[PDB]
Structure formats: C-alpha cells, structure tokens
C-alpha cells in the first residue's frame, strides 16, 4: 500500500526567560522513529524505533545539525510574528510546521506537503503542485513574498520528490519487519444493559496498525448513525491503535445490528453480530 514520511515541529515561546521549547518528531506512516526535544539533556536527534538505530554517526550528526538549525529558525520566526501581529512581549505563542512525502504502492512519489501555523491557525502552506504558496492573512502574505524571493518552493520540491522519497524507501526496507507488516484489528463485541429495555453494543477494534480504520453499524443491513457513538482512534502505547463504536438498541433486538470493520490489514471487511 502507500507510505508516508512526515516531520512535525512545535516551538513554544517562553517570554519570561530563555529560548522557546522546541519538539520535533519524525514518522514513517504511523510509526514514530526519531525525536528531538530542546529541553532534553542529549541535545541530539534520538532514535524511537529499532530499525533507525543501525544508522551510523554521520546520519545522527546530520539529523542533529538540521533539527537544531530548524529550531533556531522557529526561534527567529516567533520574534518576527509577535511583531507582525503587534503582540505583547509578555505572552507565549506557538509555531507549528509539518512536512512530508507520500509514495504509492509502487514506492514512487505520490504527493508532498508542507504546512505552517501560528498560534494554532493556518499561516502559510505549500500548494499541492509544489510550485506556489497559500497565505492566510497579510502577515503570511509578507512571508510568502520572502519565500518566493528565496526560491523556497523549488528547494522544497527538490526535497519532497527526491531525498524525502529516497530515504522513505530506505527506511521501509531496513524497517521492513514492522513497517511493511499490517496488523489487522482484533475485534470483538461487548454488551451493556442501560435499562430493562435498552442495551449498548460496543464493537471493539484492538491492536491494529496502521491507524486508519472505519467502523460502521448497520441495522438490518442499512448504515445507522443515530444512537451511535464513535470514539477517536487512540494509541495503545505499544505502537498499535484502538477504537470502538457503540449503538443503543432495544433489548432483544441485538441480532438486527452488525458492526462492519474495514482496515488495510483485512482482505475483506469483517462483520460482527451479537448472538
């Protein structure tokens, strides 16, 4: 199937003293593989998956150099943005950046992306054509003109179509034993009376990977959304994910309802029914 490599950066200003907090995390699909935390003692990019540990010192030196350089760019950014928005020196603010590339099931480049936010709102984004930028407001418009003058889209398109995809391919190979394994959801249904007359059925999907999943309830074979609840997909903490969907039904009519589970690890969708 398709794969992605993405990096997420967050920088949080600390007005009263010192430099912003900066946290960077790198993923291949839903697997985190590196982190950098400005507050940690190492001051290095650190591994967070076993398959990245086989990279040599040059790799780690280079990743560390780049990530610290990024943190310093966000540091300058936070100062400029406070000025763009005429904000007090007293408040804490946030910059966030995300970028990455996707490849299809042939491992060829499919798409690339970069988005940047200030205080949790879109600020500037690379368009899908990798050639131009979207700016949300007149501050970002200024940034867009700066980034156009410096030919940033061209350099970023180079990364996204080249080195991003090349290293994603390398990781997929080295980490094949987990990164190319799909863990189908382990599913079951539980039953919870709510009164004499109604009961909740809860359809569980556990220990799956990747995170993308669809759970749907049907009643007598038609999709039902009323009287249902679907929780956000959540991390188990061992690299897999969990989700459930529940429906309230009249007691005795449980057999009319089916839970339908779709996931990349399932050749055909699963159907669960209480009996």
């Amino acid at each position: 199937g398709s794969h992605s490599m993405r990096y997420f950066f967050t920088s949080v200003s600390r007005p009263g003293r010192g430099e912003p907090r900066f946290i960077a995390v790198g993923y291949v699909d839903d697997t985190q593989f590196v982190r950098f935390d400005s507050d940690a003692a190492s001051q290095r990019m650190e591994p967070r998956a076993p398959w990245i540990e086989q990279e040599g010192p040059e790799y780690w030196d280079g990743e560390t150099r780049k990530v610290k350089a990024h943190s310093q760019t966000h540091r300058v950014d936070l100062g400029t943005l406070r000025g763009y928005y005429n904000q007090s020196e007293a408040g804490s603010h946030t910059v966030q950046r995300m970028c990455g590339c996707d490849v299809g099931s042939d491992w060829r480049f499919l798409r690339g992306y970069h988005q940047y936010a200030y205080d949790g709102k879109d600020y500037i984004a690379l368009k899908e054509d990798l050639r131009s930028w979207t700016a949300a407001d007149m501050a970002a418009q200024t940034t867009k003109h700066k980034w156009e003058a410096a030919h940033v889209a061209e350099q970023l398109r180079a990364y996204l179509e080249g080195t991003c995809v090349e290293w994603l391919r390398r990781y997929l190979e080295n980490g094949k034993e987990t990164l190319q394994r799909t863990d189908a959801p382990k599913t079951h249904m539980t039953h919870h009376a709510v009164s004499d007359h109604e009961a909740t059925l809860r359809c569980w999907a556990l220990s799956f990977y990747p995170a993308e999943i669809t759970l749907t309830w049907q009643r007598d074979g038609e999709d039902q959304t009323q009287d249902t609840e679907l929780v956000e997909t959540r991390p188990a903490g061992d690299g897999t994910f969990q989700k459930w969907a529940a429906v309230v039904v009249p007691s005795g009519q449980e057999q009319r309802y089916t839970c339908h589970v779709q996931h990349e690890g399932l050749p055909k969708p699963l159907t669960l029914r209480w009996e």
């Binding site: 990096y7 790198g26 990743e63 780049k66 990530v67 350089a69 990024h70 310093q72 760019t73 300058v76 950014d77 400029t80 943005l81 763009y84 970028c99 940047y116 600020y123 500037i124 501050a139 970002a140 200024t142 940034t143 700066k146 980034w147 410096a150 940033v152 350099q155 970023l156 990364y159 080195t163 991003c164 090349e166 290293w167």
Partner: peptide
C-alpha cells in the same frame, strides 16, 4: 531524513 534548514525566517 530531515529537510535542511532552507526556509528563511518568516
């Protein structure tokens, strides 16, 4: 493998 630090500050 990160992109290098090629974005100008905003």
């Amino acid at each position: 493998f990160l992109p290098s630090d090629f974005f100008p500050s905003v």
